Design a protein around this ligand. Structure first.
Ligand SMILES: COc1ccccc1CC(=O)N1C[C@@H](C(N)=O)CC(F)(F)C1
Ligand SMILES: [Zn+2]
Length: 139
């Protein structure tokens, strides 16, 4: 579990979105596994606007943060799950690191702020849904 709170927005993995998220929907994209909903309280996360390929992520299955080198956002094949059939997920960045399904929502941060959230994993790899291109999160 986990979300990003920036201004009047809440960013979560689309497959983990709640009834409230869907009732206050701003935007959603199945191909990215992202959903943004509105909030009544004000958020203070800083979204990074950069091309960093190093950062730190939170891994709930280990109660620890880990430093990682990660790839540039791209289309990556993802196996079928209970939420999606087998497909290419876009705007995904991979890194070598531990992750389990419950780790989704954990934040990846670089020196500039929030980069994205855990969205996929398996076999010693962890994938993050990028949020740095969503310029509207700020205005
Ligand atoms: C962090 O996730 C994992 C880590 C280790 C092993 C397995 C996973 C799970 C995983 O990759 N998915 C894909 C994900 C998606 N974005 O399509 C949806 C899902 F969470 F239900 C299953
Ligand atoms: Zn950065």
């Amino acid at each position: 579990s986990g979300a990003i709170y920036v201004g009047n927005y809440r960013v979560v993995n689309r497959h983990l979105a709640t009834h409230n998220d869907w009732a206050n929907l701003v935007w959603e994209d199945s191909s990215r596994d992202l959903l943004v909903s509105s909030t009544t309280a004000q958020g203070c996360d800083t979204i990074a606007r950069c091309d960093c390929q190093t950062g730190v992520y939170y891994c709930s299955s280990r109660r620890k943060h880990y430093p990682v080198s990660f790839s540039k956002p791209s289309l990556i094949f993802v196996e079928a799950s209970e939420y999606y059939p087998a497909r290419y997920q876009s705007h995904l960045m991979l890194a070598v690191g531990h992750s389990e399904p419950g780790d989704c929502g954990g934040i990846l941060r670089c020196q500039h702020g929030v980069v994205g959230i855990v969205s996929t994993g398996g076999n010693g790899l962890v994938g993050f849904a990028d949020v740095r291109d969503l310029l509207w999160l700020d205005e």
